[PDB]
Design a protein around this ligand. Sequence first.
Ligand code: ZN
Length: 256
Amino acid sequence: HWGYGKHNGPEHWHKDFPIAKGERQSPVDIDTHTAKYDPSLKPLSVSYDQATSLRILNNGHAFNVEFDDSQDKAVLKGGPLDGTYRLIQFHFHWGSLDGQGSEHTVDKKKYAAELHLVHWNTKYGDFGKAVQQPDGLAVLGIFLKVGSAKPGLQKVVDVLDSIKTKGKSADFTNFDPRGLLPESLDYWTYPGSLTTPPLLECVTWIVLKEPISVSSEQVLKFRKLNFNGEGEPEELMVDNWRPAQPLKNRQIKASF
Ligand SMILES: [Zn+2]
């Protein structure tokens, strides 16, 4: 099946998912001189005080922290959005080296990792219906650079031991996503898609301008994960990032 190796990598996805070559594929390079300041764009509204995390699972191409989205407990509104988007899960993309790992790039600069906070439009009723709509999801993208430790990230770092191989899951309650946000909510936004199959073009991307920094040792633990299931030959979960896709006349707007 699809993965990130030379034989099942991003360059191959189009065979099973032709939308891979679509008009609004993600990620993209953010050209900062070409992005347009849009003054009509409202400030992002992140209300995560009532977030309920449930669990963490190694799905074979990352590890997701899942939240209870049966009520409007953790939501995103404002910015370029219309309505309420409920937080469903967050996951990262990282590299084998600190010089790569993010999906989105800024003026072609790659970061060590990229965090994606996935949200779905509540007028569609469920995540599965939302992925079939043009304004179905909203993904908050946050870049990670290696520097000082991120306190709020350590609880995640500590449980990875437990979900080492594909298919493993662990209880992961009372985790507050607020500890993963930078100070500034300035962002860039554009219409795009999921970055892993099915690559559905249902995403409004909100990429934060300010990176969060994490320590070399925190990123090191992400690289100890496996793409393989237990009792299989070990394959380090590294470089689970899709390269930049053509912008194709979409316009990137800036809130600043
Ligand atoms: Zn992602």
